[PDB]
Design a protein around this nucleic acid. Structure first.
Ligand SMILES: [Mg+2]
Ligand SMILES: [Mg+2]
Ligand SMILES: [Mg+2]
Ligand SMILES: [Mg+2]
Ligand SMILES: [Mg+2]
Ligand SMILES: [Mg+2]
Ligand SMILES: [Mg+2]
Ligand SMILES: [Mg+2]
Ligand SMILES: [Mg+2]
Ligand SMILES: [Mg+2]
Ligand SMILES: [Mg+2]
Ligand SMILES: [Mg+2]
Ligand SMILES: [Mg+2]
Ligand SMILES: [Mg+2]
Ligand SMILES: [Mg+2]
Lengths: 126, 99, 85, 153, 91, 25, 212
RNA sequence: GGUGAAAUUCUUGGAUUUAUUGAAGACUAACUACUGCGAAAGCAUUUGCCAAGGAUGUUUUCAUUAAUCAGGAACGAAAGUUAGGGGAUCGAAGACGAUCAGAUACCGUCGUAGUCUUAACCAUAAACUAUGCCGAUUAGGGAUCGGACGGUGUUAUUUUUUGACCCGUUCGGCACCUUACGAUAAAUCAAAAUGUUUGGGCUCCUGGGGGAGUAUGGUCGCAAGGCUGAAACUUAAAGAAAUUG
């Protein structure tokens, strides 16, 4: 039972599914939501994140990766701290494509300082 | 006309309170004036909880819960339907909605 | 009888060199010519000999310091760092 | 004359000949007559002492640093200037310093230096205000004042 | 500090270097106060005199300006000799 | 018109008035 | 296909971890002028303390391991740092209670710098009626003095490996609660993070003693 | 990347993403509250030092030493100014890409001053509780902060003291809940009550809307400007709180 880690970037503009070794120095496969759609607005769609997840899940078979630790992060730090819709699609697809799921953790960068975010004072007048 | 007894915030006796940034606007608003929601929900949706339990190896794993604190300005909370306009008499009721 | 109102020591330059330059110079002219307290005997007899050199008339002890002050903010911050370190 | 930073004449004892070796250092802010100056690898870390850069902790302030071992003083010798020790590397004996110009540099860990800041700081903060004050400033240095504008030639 | 204010109120003290040595030579002095910025040769001379007379020495953590103020005087003082403690507990 | 920028317009007009007087003086 | 030219190694845990085979890894193989020995020397692996100790009560902690030597197809990793998980830390704060954080830096007997972040929370009494459980700032400062004194004294009289043996049961938090019962009673007294600053001269006898 | 959707922009010179380390500057999240301190402006990591402060308790001392204050003085957010240091992020001005009839805007990518700090200015904010300071009295109630007191039982220590929790009393605060013997034009108010049954003490400000916080004179400021401050002329309304559409 070979363990890997699946670092998943889930923003509101795009989704990243990224599998590496236990240290992260060596990356196995890395496909994004924008690699599976023809429109920029669909890069973060739940459907796109699912399609990207399958090809990562398909690709991990050849190296014999059987179990994946999953790390979920959003565009944290000087930004939002809520994962995009792509995070849910990836979790379901890996759990169904034939992968064992190990430890699941949130690794969104949490700033204890929070330098000045863009937009203020009145923010985005929309 | 004074609409509210507490104006729009809670700083009676505090002088000045450092502002914060709105969650989805980045508006600079005081911390006590802002509308704050503490959300505790499972890191995986209830529909996909079963599949995660299927892939458990290691089948006694409990899915962790995301711990978010969302801070909103008045414009965003109203437009996001977090809070709603209440009647003149119903504005004074400082009780959370029942479950 | 409180001669002058604003120029102070910089009244020896007349109406010359511009108002701003005469203010910038009197910041250091007053410090340059002032008498300081000796740190070796406590007498108020330390005056600038030349630039960067300050001599005590009573101790006959010469000290090296700033150009227009006996000590600079950098040296004091530097010196306090070593003592605490 | 013509320097802007005071000099200090320090007297040592010759370890071989029974004679006093006069030598002129560049004084630091804090030095005084009658002070004892210690120079060597085992010298204490006080202002005015001359120590190798390898035996001095990072973040310090030194002056009259030498690029090459034996080149008796090259860097940080004007009025308010100084050299900061950024970090060490004892595997091969090299020390990384920061120069007054803001450039980082790697020198031998056996290179010497004087703890502190050179005396006379803040000299260039007072306007000269007069063609005389510029004239007397350069009269003891060299013949380079005044400069006619080339566009007027 | 505050103890020195009491002894000057009641007891007998000696201010100055030339008279402190005279007190030490007589042997009647029992406490010596030395300022922080006294000349090191003079400081070492006073300490050596006390060792001869078995007299306690206190190194005041202050300059002549502060030591003279502590006695209530308006002049700088570099060293002291306490001959009679008076109603104080400085001993 | 907002009173904030009615004040700004007058304040700008006052600055121009002082320059016209300095010119004559 | 740049994966047939990549070999797979293993990870070896040091004492006193129950499970010594942490897992596998991937790297480019030796091909001349590119050695595998120095390519893996310095890698960091973040693994759960629960897996190493085969327990379900350690699921919220993580242990970092640093590659120091390679023995064939096994990398003898040494302890590199202890830390919590994000899920546990956010669940621990809550409201209406005072959070106390203490930090210190200790030098072990084998020339190791370790910065230890200690965390604690106030205790709700069984018969308490009021909502809040806040502590006075004088008590908090008094609590912090006790915490720093215990952490410094407890970790100073031990080596690096001895400290890890102390961290596994979280024994240090036990006396911190015990010492602070008379000031203000606490809960969830833990060591939130363990971070090393420098290392001494690299050793093999000490390294092999943990793996043998 | 980014958006409602895009584009400017970066990218096979490996962009974005992954791990480790370093540097820089700013900031101090979650804990964080109808909680605290400060005259106000304001104040949130640890430690040490320096000086200060209110409340409490008092069978300590002085004995009217007091209240409010025209002129007068200290402090005074942000922005702005002068001279150095620093300059990560954000970001006036400016340049582009969109949208649009136009878009000198909202949106997006850059980006200077500024944002940070030492020395010196400036003295204005919806500087608001839009509610001056001192004093007395007047309906109930529960929370909470600091101190003190009395009682009770657990808990940790203890040659039985102290801390946490519980109940009650009282002083002093931040406020809050119901009510009207009252007040107001009303909204609402335990003060905006004790006022045509009109007098406790003191200071400041206003007299329909504009012109106008303008002109001029004076004074302060490096400047921006601040303080003081009209008149001609014009007009039958402007305005406050509620009511039905
Ligand atoms: Mg305010
Ligand atoms: Mg010509
Ligand atoms: Mg790359
Ligand atoms: Mg508090
Ligand atoms: Mg904090
Ligand atoms: Mg007190
Ligand atoms: Mg005003
Ligand atoms: Mg007002
Ligand atoms: Mg009253
Ligand atoms: Mg109370
Ligand atoms: Mg109480
Ligand atoms: Mg209060
Ligand atoms: Mg009238
Ligand atoms: Mg009028
Ligand atoms: Mg109306």
């Amino acid at each position: 039972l070979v363990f890997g880690v699946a670092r998943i970037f889930a923003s509101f503009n795009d989704t990243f599914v990224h599998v590496t070794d236990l240290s992260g120095r060596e990356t196995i496969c890395r496909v994004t939501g924008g690699m599976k759609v023809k429109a920029d607005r669909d890069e973060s769609s739940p459907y796109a994140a699912m399609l990207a997840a399958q090809d990562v899940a398909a690709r991990c078979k050849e190296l014999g990766i059987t179990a994946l630790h999953i790390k979920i992060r959003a565009t944290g730090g000087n930004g939002t701290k809520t994962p995009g819709p792509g995070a849910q699609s990836a979790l379901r697809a890996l759990a169904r494509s034939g992968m064992k799921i190990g430890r699941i953790e949130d690794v969104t960068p949490t700033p204890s300082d929070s330098t000045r975010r863009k937009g203020g004072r009145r923010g985005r007048r929309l | 006309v004074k609409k509210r007894k507490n104006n729009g915030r809670n700083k009676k006796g505090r002088g000045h309170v450092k502002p914060i940034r709105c969650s989805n606007c980045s508006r600079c608003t005081p911390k006590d004036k802002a509308i704050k929601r503490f959300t505790i929900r499972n890191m995986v949706e209830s529909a996909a909880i079963r599949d995660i339990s299927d892939a458990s190896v290691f089948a006694e794993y409990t899915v962790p819960k995301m711990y978010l604190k969302l801070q909103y300005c008045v414009s965003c909370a109203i437009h996001g339907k977090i809070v709603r306009v209440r009647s003149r008499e119903g504005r004074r009721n400082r009780a959370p909605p029942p479950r | 009888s409180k001669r002058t109102k604003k120029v102070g020591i910089s009244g020896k330059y007349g109406t010359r060199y511009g108002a701003s330059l005469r203010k910038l110079v009197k910041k250091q002219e007053v410090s340059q010519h002032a008498r300081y307290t000796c740190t070796f005997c406590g007498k108020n007899t330390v005056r600038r000999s030349s630039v960067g050199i300050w001599s005590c008339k009573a101790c006959k002890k010469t000290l090296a310091g700033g150009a227009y002050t006996v000590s600079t903010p950098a040296a004091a911050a530097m010196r306090s760092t070593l003592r605490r370190l | 004359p013509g320097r802007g930073a005071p000099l200090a004449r320090v007297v040592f004892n010759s370890p071989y000949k029974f004679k006093k070796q006069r030598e002129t250092f560049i004084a630091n802010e804090g030095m005084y007559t009658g002070q004892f100056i210690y120079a060597g690898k085992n010298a204490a870390l006080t202002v005015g002492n001359v120590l190798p850069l390898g035996s001095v902790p990072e973040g310090t302030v030194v002056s009259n640093v030498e690029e090459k071992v034996g080149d008796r003083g090259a860097i940080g010798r004007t009025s308010g200037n100084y050299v900061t020790v950024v970090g060490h590397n004892p595997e091969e004996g090299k020390t990384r310093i920061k120069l007054p110009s803001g450039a980082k540099k790697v020198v031998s860990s056996s290179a010497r230096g004087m703890i502190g800041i050179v005396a006379g700081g803040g000299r260039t903060d007072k306007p000269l205000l007069k063609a005389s004050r510029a004239k007397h400033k350069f009269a003891v240095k060299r013949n380079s004042w005044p400069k006619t504008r080339g566009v007027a030639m | 500090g505050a103890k020195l204010a009491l002894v000057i109120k009641s007891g007998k003290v000696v201010l100055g270097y030339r008279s402190t040595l005279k007190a030490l030579r007589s042997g009647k002095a029992k406490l010596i106060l030395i300022s922080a910025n006294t000349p090191p040769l003079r400081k070492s001379e006073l300490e050596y005199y006390s060792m001869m007379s078995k007299t306690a020495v206190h190194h005041y953590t202050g300059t002549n300006i502060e030591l003279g103020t502590a006695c209530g005087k308006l002049f700088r003082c570099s060293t002291m000799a306490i001959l009679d403690a008076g109603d104080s507990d400085i001993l | 018109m907002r009173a904030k920028w009615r004040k700004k317009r007058v304040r700008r007009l006052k600055r121009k008035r002082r320059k016209m007087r300095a010119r004559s003086k | 296909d740049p994966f047939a030219r990549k070999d797979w190694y293993g990870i070896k845990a040091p004492a006193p971890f129950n499970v010594r085979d942490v897992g596998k890894t991937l790297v480019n193989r030796t091909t001349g002028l590119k050695n595998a020995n120095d390519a893996l020397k310095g890698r960091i692996f973040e693994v759960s303390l629960a897996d190493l100790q085969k327990d379900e009560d350690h699921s919220f902690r993580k242990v970092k391991l640093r590659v120091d030597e390679i023995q064939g197809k096994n990398c003898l990793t040494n302890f590199h740092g202890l830390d919590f998980t994000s899920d546990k830390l956010r669940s621990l704060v809550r409201k209406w209670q005072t959070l106390i954080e203490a930090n210190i830096t200790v030098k072990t007997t084998d020339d190791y710098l370790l910065r230890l972040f200690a965390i604690a929370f106030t205790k709700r009494r069984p018969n308490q009626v009021k909502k809040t459980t806040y502590a006075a700032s004088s008590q908090i400062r008094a609590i912090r003095r006790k915490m720093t004194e215990i952490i410094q004294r407890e970790a100073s009289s031990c080596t690096l490996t001895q400290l890890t043996s102390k961290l596994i049961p979280e024994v240090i938090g036990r006396e911190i609660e015990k010492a602070t019962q008379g000031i203000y009673p606490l809960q969830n007294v833990h060591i939130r993070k363990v971070k090393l600053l420098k290392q001494p001269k690299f050793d093999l006898g000490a390294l092999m003693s943990l793996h043998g």
